[PDB]
Amino acid sequence: MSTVDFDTIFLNQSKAPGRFRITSSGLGWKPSSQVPTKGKTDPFLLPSGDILSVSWSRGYRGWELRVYTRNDKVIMLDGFEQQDFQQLKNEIQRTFNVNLEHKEHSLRGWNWGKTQLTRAELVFNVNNRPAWEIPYSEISNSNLTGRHEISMELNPKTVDENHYETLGDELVEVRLYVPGQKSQLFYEQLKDKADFDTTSEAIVSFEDILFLTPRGRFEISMYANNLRLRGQSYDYKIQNKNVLRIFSLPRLDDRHHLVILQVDPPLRQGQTRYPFLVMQFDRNEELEVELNLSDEEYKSKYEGKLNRSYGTDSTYKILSHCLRGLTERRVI
Amino acid sequence: LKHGTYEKLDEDGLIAPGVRVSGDDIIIGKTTPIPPDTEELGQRTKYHT
Amino acid sequence: FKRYESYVRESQIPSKVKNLRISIDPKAQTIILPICGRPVPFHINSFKNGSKNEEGDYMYIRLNFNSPGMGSSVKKTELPYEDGDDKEFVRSLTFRSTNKERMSEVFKAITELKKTAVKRDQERKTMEDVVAQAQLVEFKGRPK
Amino acid sequence: GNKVHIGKVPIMLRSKFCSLRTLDEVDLYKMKECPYDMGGYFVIN
Amino acid sequence: SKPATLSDINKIIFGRTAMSKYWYYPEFDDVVKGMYLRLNTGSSPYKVVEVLGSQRIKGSAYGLNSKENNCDMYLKVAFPNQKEMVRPLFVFSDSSITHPEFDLFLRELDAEGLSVMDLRDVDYKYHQLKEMSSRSLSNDEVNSIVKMKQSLSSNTGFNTVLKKAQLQEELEEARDAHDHERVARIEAELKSIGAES
Amino acid sequence: GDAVLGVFMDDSGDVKSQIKFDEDFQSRDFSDSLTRYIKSNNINPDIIGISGFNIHTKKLFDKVNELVNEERLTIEYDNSDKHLIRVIYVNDE
Amino acid sequence: GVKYTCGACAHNFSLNKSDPVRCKECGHRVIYKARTKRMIQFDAR
Ligand SMILES: [Zn+2]
């Protein structure tokens, strides 16, 4: 029985090379014994009955063999040479009766196209060619971020007792823009496919705040240890310790209210800096906000510093109280 | 220069222990700067400073 | 739409790509991004703006791309994408890395490549509507 | 008004304010001082 | 941009004696960064490691060359095939890197998918080492190095005598101030330090 | 202890630059410095004069002639067999 | 270029006529030159 084997093959973007083997019972992959990989040394085995289809395409480390399973999982094997294609094609056809499909990918560098939800992967097509595909098993969560905007979070692969160390830069989040009255139907189908569960983060967020300095509009997301300013062109992370002083000052126009943060070190945009952040509110702007905190964490850490819910009071008062409670700085 | 011999001095202008010395030999080499003359006319750096 | 391309053949993609990391090709103005083991090229023209945030040990860099709806300041006359109501767009990709220094250098090099591309396009436009003039004929005697 | 410095007084060797009044016999050798030296003189320049 | 040959790497050989001669320099941390040197594996086939950085470790003073050669500097290196390692300075050997050693280092780099230092970078390292070795230290740098070695100083007869004299002076100062609490502590410290032979 | 002095004058008759050669005239450094002075500074003298008080100047003349023949220091001609810059002795009463 | 010896810890080193006169490891201000490498011969009389 001619066992065909390939050395230096990687499984699912593994850091360690392994030996790949084709047998009448299925596919086998085993890590090469030369790397101390804190990790089970157990061979990966895929039964012949679980193989649905196999595609051949360009990967990072040479050519990639992508195996589609009947259980809607995608297995990626990378590290093949271009010459291996003829041997692999003949052996896969002989052993599994499956055609090895050659899949050419779009290299145009365009960020527009059509998404296509295939059984096991989300495919992005550019000029009728696949630019990239994401297996549904790699998608952790999906969330509608606007009327035409879909954000997909990918499982950050850190340390799991069942996965080989990954080598390189990891994709964490993909945002798609789907025009037309269409993004909600696209989201529903994707969400239903893998039962994605929505999550909520950030103790409190304030959207669309006008800053006079730096000039622009920013979302303010507050955390236990840090404040985030999210701006179209600039994201800032300020530690609560770096906030020295909070000023809450009425403007003489008797229509706007100023909230001013002194930050050390001063925020940077290039040459000159921003030691003071100047926010401008309308006095008639009212906001209702519930804190994203568990009842046990609220009672233990924030009782008497923050309110569990703020009623419909002026936005600048709620913001000034939240800043006081999280930074422990007195409002002037 | 003194009429003695300067060949017993090291690179730093100090003689080293264990060296036999005689009268008028130079045991400490010291120089004091002097404003240069018009010898920079045609002297190839070989002018007394 | 000003048509552009990153690579025509897979051979054109540099051999330096073998690292499963973000590789930048200044000659082809291309930002190759590792999407699930795929060397996906993204032309600097399609790229819009970038935001870098070092969260913990990983450096989370969100690379934004041109998307319709109050996007780039470029006038309607020239669009960085082809017109299409049925066209869907990659609006942003966020990557993380344990190596902070290199990831900061990669971000600087993407930003520099964009500045050089914009400067070259301005220089072209300052020469575009300019009509190719005839060559000045020098006076064969003493000129006034 | 506090401790203003008015000058430096030379110290007689082996006197009460000398550093060699202490140090015993062993440390007197580490400091390259002869134990037979009796003191009673100053060191100027 | 050309790959470095054996002679280019040999030009930047930094021996263990040179390490002891220059490890206390403030710039030595960046000087040793990225260098290639022969290392005793111990577990012995000598191999080459790449310096990912250095980390001072207090309380880990070790004999570098002799008994008096106490050192607190540590080098964080790593084999290409193997993982990151924090090693003391004396592990490296003054002997030159052999052809099979450099060949194995190249094979491990190829297995990992890494490259060799550029010839321009090799020249930059060589110039950095030449500047550092021929540099003239300042008075402040000398004081800093002396204080660092004093912190590393376990014991020295001259320094012990100086410390005992300073303690005696402090004790007489406390006595003249009628401080009956400090003087007891100073007497206990003097008793502990003393009892010579 | 006899350094070589160089003085260049333009067609205007006004001194433009004077240089000192403090190395030995038989060293490679002397020839390299003279070539740098001749070429880099755009001096481009039309003729080079050499004179002295004794026969030692003859060796300098020979060395200069060899340098001219070696470096092909042709005269710059304002806008093609470019001609070499002549080196001769000068009467000096 | 020329060796030196510290006056307290007896540590050998060298100077380049530009370093401060100081022992590198204990900071002593007094150093001594090392013996010459020439041959020294005596008449044994
Ligand atoms: Zn010393």
Side-chain angles (χ1 to χ4, degrees):
Chain A
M1 285 182 156
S2 50
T3 49
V4 177
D5 58 321
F6 300 88
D7 291 322
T8 65
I9 304 306
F10 304 87
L11 176 71
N12 297 334
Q13 309 166 29
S14 65
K15 177 175 169 192
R19 185 167 177 183
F20 176 64
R21 299 189 186 162
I22 304 177
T23 64
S24 58
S25 61
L27 304 182
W29 181 95
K30 185 182 176 176
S32 183
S33 51
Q34 304 180 1
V35 186
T37 304
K38 301 180 180 180
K40 281 176 173 178
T41 53
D42 298 339
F44 176 77
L45 300 174
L46 178 72
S48 58
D50 294 348
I51 302 170
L52 180 67
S53 65
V54 190
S55 69
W56 179 258
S57 58
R58 190 69 176 79
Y60 260 84
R61 295 181 178 155
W63 295 86
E64 181 194 352
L65 192 78
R66 186 175 291 180
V67 181
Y68 300 95
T69 67
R70 294 186 186 180
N71 303 335
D72 306 335
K73 296 179 184 177
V74 182
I75 298 155
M76 300 174 276
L77 292 161
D78 56 353
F80 299 98
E81 299 199 359
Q82 190 171 13
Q83 303 178 0
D84 303 337
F85 176 71
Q86 301 179 359
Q87 185 178 8
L88 283 167
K89 183 174 180 178
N90 294 336
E91 290 299 343
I92 293 169
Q93 188 66 26
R94 183 183 181 195
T95 307
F96 308 118
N97 196 41
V98 175
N99 293 329
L100 183 63
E101 294 183 359
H102 184 216
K103 193 177 185 188
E104 292 191 359
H105 285 72
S106 189
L107 307 176
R108 292 192 173 186
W110 301 351
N111 72 299
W112 58 101
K114 293 189 175 191
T115 63
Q116 280 189 2
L117 295 169
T118 66
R119 189 177 181 181
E121 60 183 3
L122 170 63
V123 182
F124 189 78
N125 290 322
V126 176
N127 186 9
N128 305 330
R129 295 182 183 216
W132 50 266
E133 317 91 341
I134 299 171
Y136 296 133
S137 61
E138 296 198 337
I139 306 180
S140 67
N141 195 18
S142 55
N143 294 123
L144 284 161
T145 52
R147 192 176 187 175
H148 299 296
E149 295 178 38
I150 307 177
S151 298
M152 299 172 293
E153 297 182 349
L154 296 159
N155 291 289
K157 296 184 178 182
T158 56
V159 176
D160 303 346
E161 297 179 337
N162 292 326
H163 278 53
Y164 300 95
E165 288 184 359
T166 38
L167 196 279
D169 301 339
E170 295 176 350
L171 186 68
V172 180
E173 184 194 21
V174 179
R175 305 193 183 191
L176 301 177
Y177 175 83
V178 180
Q181 301 178 7
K182 285 185 184 176
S183 69
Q184 183 173 353
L185 288 199
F186 181 89
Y187 172 82
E188 287 167 356
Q189 296 153 359
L190 176 69
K191 187 184 188 175
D192 295 350
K193 278 193 172 193
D195 298 346
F196 296 124
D197 296 344
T198 69
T199 185
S200 297
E201 307 296 327
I203 304 183
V204 57
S205 54
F206 301 86
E207 297 180 9
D208 201 27
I209 296 177
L210 181 67
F211 286 61
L212 295 180
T213 294
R215 174 262 182 176
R217 229 98 173 189
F218 296 88
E219 181 203 347
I220 304 187
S221 295
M222 309 196 171
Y223 306 88
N225 296 332
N226 309 306
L227 179 78
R228 191 175 179 169
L229 310 176
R230 305 176 184 177
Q232 184 165 340
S233 312
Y234 298 96
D235 283 3
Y236 305 110
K237 188 172 186 166
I238 300 155
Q239 296 179 331
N240 292 349
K241 63 174 178 179
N242 296 356
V243 182
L244 296 185
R245 300 185 183 94
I246 305 159
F247 306 86
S248 185
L249 302 176
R251 193 173 167 162
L252 307 173
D253 301 359
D254 301 344
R255 185 173 176 176
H256 303 100
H257 198 101
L258 303 176
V259 182
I260 309 173
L261 300 177
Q262 185 172 9
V263 190
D264 189 20
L267 277 169
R268 298 168 178 268
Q269 192 176 2
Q271 175 174 334
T272 85
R273 304 162 199 177
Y274 298 105
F276 297 97
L277 309 173
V278 182
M279 299 167 281
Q280 183 185 8
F281 297 90
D282 190 339
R283 277 172 153 187
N284 305 327
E285 192 196 330
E286 295 174 353
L287 184 72
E288 181 169 11
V289 185
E290 298 194 346
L291 299 186
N292 190 21
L293 291 170
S294 67
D295 292 343
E296 299 186 0
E297 288 175 326
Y298 178 77
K299 287 174 184 172
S300 59
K301 292 176 183 169
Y302 299 110
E303 188 167 7
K305 296 183 183 177
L306 296 174
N307 299 340
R308 180 65 184 87
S309 57
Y310 296 87
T312 312
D313 299 352
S314 316
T315 304
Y316 75 87
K317 292 179 181 164
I318 298 173
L319 183 74
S320 298
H321 188 271
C322 291
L323 287 164
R324 181 182 170 193
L326 294 176
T327 69
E328 307 190 341
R329 302 307 189 189
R330 297 185 183 192
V331 182
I332 303 168
Chain B
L1 291 170
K2 306 285 191 284
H3 76 264
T5 175
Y6 292 77
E7 295 304 319
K8 283 163 178 170
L9 293 180
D10 273 5
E11 186 172 0
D12 56 353
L14 303 173
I15 201 153
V19 176
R20 185 256 197 279
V21 286
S22 314
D24 291 326
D25 282 7
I26 307 292
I27 52 160
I28 292 164
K30 202 175 57 162
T31 61
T32 180
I34 286 290
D37 205 0
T38 66
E39 289 187 337
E40 319 199 321
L41 180 146
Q43 291 300 315
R44 48 173 70 111
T45 312
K46 284 191 175 181
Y47 55 104
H48 316 314
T49 82
Chain C
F1 157 61
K2 180 185 179 180
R3 188 174 174 180
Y4 49 85
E5 57 182 1
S6 295
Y7 302 106
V8 179
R9 303 177 181 180
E10 301 174 356
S11 62
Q12 302 184 4
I13 309 180
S15 297
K16 188 187 177 181
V17 76
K18 305 187 175 58
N19 50 29
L20 275 164
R21 286 176 169 182
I22 304 176
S23 54
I24 321 165
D25 189 13
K27 310 175 181 180
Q29 303 175 15
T30 299
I31 319 166
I32 312 175
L33 295 176
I35 305 183
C36 309
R38 279 272 179 261
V40 199
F42 283 90
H43 203 272
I44 200 65
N45 295 356
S46 69
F47 172 77
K48 188 184 175 185
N49 63 308
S51 57
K52 50 168 181 179
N53 299 298
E54 298 192 354
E55 306 170 359
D57 293 351
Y58 290 101
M59 188 168 184
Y60 294 80
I61 300 196
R62 184 179 297 172
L63 299 175
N64 309 347
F65 304 102
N66 297 313
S67 61
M70 197 169 91
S72 297
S73 61
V74 195
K75 294 185 177 180
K76 325 176 193 182
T77 304
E78 296 192 16
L79 277 196
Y81 52 79
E82 191 180 0
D83 305 4
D85 298 357
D86 290 334
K87 289 167 180 163
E88 299 170 356
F89 288 68
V90 176
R91 190 171 186 150
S92 69
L93 299 172
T94 307
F95 292 86
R96 72 178 192 164
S97 160
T98 53
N99 190 319
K100 303 185 178 179
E101 294 180 352
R102 175 186 54 88
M103 189 60 91
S104 281
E105 291 175 354
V106 168
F107 188 74
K108 286 175 183 178
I110 290 167
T111 304
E112 184 171 10
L113 186 66
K114 186 62 176 193
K115 286 175 180 181
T116 305
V118 172
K119 185 182 176 195
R120 185 184 290 117
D121 280 351
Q122 292 175 353
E123 286 170 355
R124 190 190 297 219
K125 288 183 180 204
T126 53
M127 289 256 181
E128 269 178 7
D129 303 346
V130 174
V131 177
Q133 302 205 159
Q135 300 180 0
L136 187 79
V137 182
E138 296 180 14
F139 190 81
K140 183 178 179 180
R142 294 183 181 277
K144 298 175 173 188
Chain D
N2 278 316
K3 297 158 172 173
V4 65
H5 176 251
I6 63 170
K8 279 194 278 294
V9 170
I11 293 304
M12 195 187 263
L13 265 74
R14 305 293 185 104
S15 64
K16 188 180 180 294
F17 289 93
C18 178
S19 309
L20 315 176
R21 172 56 74 91
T22 52
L23 296 190
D24 206 0
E25 181 58 273
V26 191
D27 307 317
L28 212 59
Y29 278 117
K30 291 183 181 165
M31 293 293 108
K32 308 292 180 62
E33 294 292 328
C34 186
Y36 289 117
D37 200 30
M38 72 293 290
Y41 54 92
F42 308 92
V43 177
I44 297 89
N45 299 328
Chain E
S1 75
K2 299 165 185 168
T5 74
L6 193 78
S7 189
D8 307 309
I9 308 176
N10 288 337
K11 290 163 196 171
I12 65 156
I13 286 171
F14 198 66
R16 172 182 52 167
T17 304
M19 270 196 280
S20 197
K21 200 164 166 193
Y22 299 114
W23 68 272
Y24 39 79
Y25 284 61
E27 298 145 40
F28 172 80
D29 177 32
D30 307 324
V31 169
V32 73
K33 177 175 175 186
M35 295 191 60
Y36 307 139
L37 282 178
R38 200 178 201 219
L39 183 87
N40 197 330
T41 312
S43 64
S44 308
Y46 294 83
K47 288 176 70 66
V48 179
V49 290
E50 193 166 329
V51 179
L52 313 179
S54 70
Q55 179 168 69
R56 293 192 60 205
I57 307 186
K58 294 184 183 183
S60 193
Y62 57 88
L64 187 41
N65 292 329
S66 170
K67 292 139 190 197
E68 320 203 328
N69 288 139
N70 282 327
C71 187
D72 74 88
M73 183 57 68
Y74 273 81
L75 286 177
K76 192 180 189 204
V77 300
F79 296 82
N81 207 328
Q82 316 184 354
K83 289 195 181 165
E84 324 172 344
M85 292 174 177
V86 193
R87 312 295 210 153
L89 269 68
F90 68 89
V91 186
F92 299 93
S93 60
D94 286 328
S95 64
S96 43
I97 292 162
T98 68
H99 274 102
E101 194 182 333
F102 182 44
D103 289 335
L104 280 157
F105 191 71
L106 289 148
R107 302 286 73 69
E108 295 154 58
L109 290 164
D110 301 358
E112 298 284 331
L114 293 172
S115 68
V116 71
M117 182 191 288
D118 290 25
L119 273 186
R120 189 176 62 253
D121 304 0
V122 161
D123 185 46
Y124 168 72
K125 299 289 94 176
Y126 172 73
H127 286 301
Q128 186 156 354
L129 275 72
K130 296 300 288 185
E131 150 182 39
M132 192 267 289
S133 72
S134 65
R135 204 159 59 83
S136 287
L137 295 164
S138 176
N139 284 306
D140 306 274
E141 280 154 50
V142 165
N143 310 320
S144 58
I145 296 166
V146 167
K147 278 148 214 178
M148 181 177 176
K149 282 191 177 181
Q150 269 161 351
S151 70
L152 270 189
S153 177
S154 67
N155 192 287
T156 296
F158 210 94
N159 294 117
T160 59
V161 171
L162 259 66
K163 258 81 168 180
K164 190 160 41 70
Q166 189 263 332
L167 259 63
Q168 279 269 16
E169 179 182 2
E170 208 275 342
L171 188 150
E172 70 180 2
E173 181 196 13
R175 278 217 195 116
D176 272 328
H178 279 329
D179 294 352
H180 315 304
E181 299 83 2
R182 181 155 74 164
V183 63
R185 175 216 290 104
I186 305 300
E187 284 266 21
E189 191 175 359
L190 277 171
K191 196 146 282 193
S192 77
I193 294 174
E196 304 163 358
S197 71
Chain F
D2 290 22
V4 171
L5 204 51
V7 159
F8 161 68
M9 199 172 45
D10 61 347
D11 51 282
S12 311
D14 308 335
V15 175
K16 196 58 68 173
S17 52
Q18 55 275 25
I19 192 163
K20 294 188 181 184
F21 306 102
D22 55 357
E23 60 269 30
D24 286 343
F25 72 103
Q26 316 157 87
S27 76
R28 288 268 81 77
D29 292 316
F30 180 74
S31 307
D32 294 327
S33 285
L34 185 47
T35 318
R36 284 177 53 251
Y37 185 54
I38 284 167
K39 291 174 70 175
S40 305
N41 301 315
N42 300 321
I43 299 314
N44 319 129
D46 312 331
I47 186 167
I48 287 175
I50 301 178
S51 163
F53 307 122
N54 47 40
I55 77 164
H56 291 294
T57 305
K58 165 172 161 77
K59 299 172 178 173
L60 162 70
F61 171 84
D62 300 325
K63 176 65 174 151
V64 163
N65 204 350
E66 292 273 32
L67 170 72
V68 174
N69 289 289
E70 180 57 36
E71 309 275 5
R72 316 291 305 199
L73 307 174
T74 48
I75 187 63
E76 281 205 353
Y77 179 76
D78 297 88
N79 294 320
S80 64
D81 283 332
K82 290 193 180 185
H83 301 283
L84 277 184
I85 295 168
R86 274 284 286 283
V87 168
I88 62 168
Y89 297 113
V90 185
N91 202 4
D92 68 324
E93 306 96 347
Chain G
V2 295
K3 294 281 185 178
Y4 290 96
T5 302
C6 172
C9 68
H11 168 72
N12 283 317
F13 54 87
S14 302
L15 290 193
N16 55 0
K17 315 172 290 293
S18 301
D19 291 1
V21 185
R22 188 95 66 91
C23 178
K24 307 301 183 70
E25 71 190 27
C26 76
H28 210 175
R29 301 297 177 104
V30 170
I31 63 179
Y32 300 94
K33 280 184 60 78
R35 282 170 69 91
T36 180
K37 298 287 96 175
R38 305 182 187 184
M39 273 194 284
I40 314 163
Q41 196 174 11
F42 290 102
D43 57 346
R45 287 188 203 199

